[PDB]
Amino acid sequence: GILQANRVLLSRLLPGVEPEGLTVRHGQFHQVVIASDRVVCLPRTAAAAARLPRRAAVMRVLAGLDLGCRTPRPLCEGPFLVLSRVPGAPLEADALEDSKVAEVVAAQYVTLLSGLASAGADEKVRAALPAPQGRWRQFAADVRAELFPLMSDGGCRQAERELAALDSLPDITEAVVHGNLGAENVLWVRDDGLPRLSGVIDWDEVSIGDPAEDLAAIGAGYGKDFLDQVLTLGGWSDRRMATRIATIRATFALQQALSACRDGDEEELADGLTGYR
């Protein structure tokens, strides 16, 4: 096992903590040992192990930004990286039925997103963070090579429309983009008056990019009414932005499928390809 195997390390990083009481989450690049107030990231390959010093720099940079909330702060690196655990829990889509909850939750997303946008200009950031060229064309090529063979003729025609539209996108690199800003990744303090944003986790996909990507993720998680509220509060409701959001949002099923295809995750692959086959 992973706990028994890394027990010497865990005894140094978590003195007196029984390793069999911990839990391990099985990432792509990393096993993540979860303690009460922190996690230990261990690379699953020599590729990940080589990348971990950069990941630690990235997390240190995010820890320095003004985002209106917490992020996993680097506590120790050695190969391993220890990050603080952000407290709180995801906010259930149903909570947004109360219009006063929706109002304060929308406002706090605007603060988060504004903070990420502003950070996009910073130097610490632009040089620590990934800024790939043509991520969406690379994606289009990956989909055609890897997913089209699994799709129906009608599926391939729908997908080829969605991919064609990715050419409409300007390769915009103005904001820090979380890249996977679903509901599960945004943590809240609940049951102490209206919900207050604790922080944001799962920064694995973080880059310099287009903030439409993060807005699309919010809409995917909470629906169009709520996204519309965020866009209006934040002054982001022009047509140019709406088009970028829709275009990117259209790729989310295919992103799920492409990941699931590479991961040998048959449940996610099936779910991802629903209506493409």
Binding site: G182, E205, A216, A217, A220, T251, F252, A253, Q255, Q256
Partner: peptide, 6 residues
């Protein structure tokens, strides 16, 4: 995991 992107 997942529709948001994962």
């Amino acid at each position: 995991k997942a529709x948001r992107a994962s």
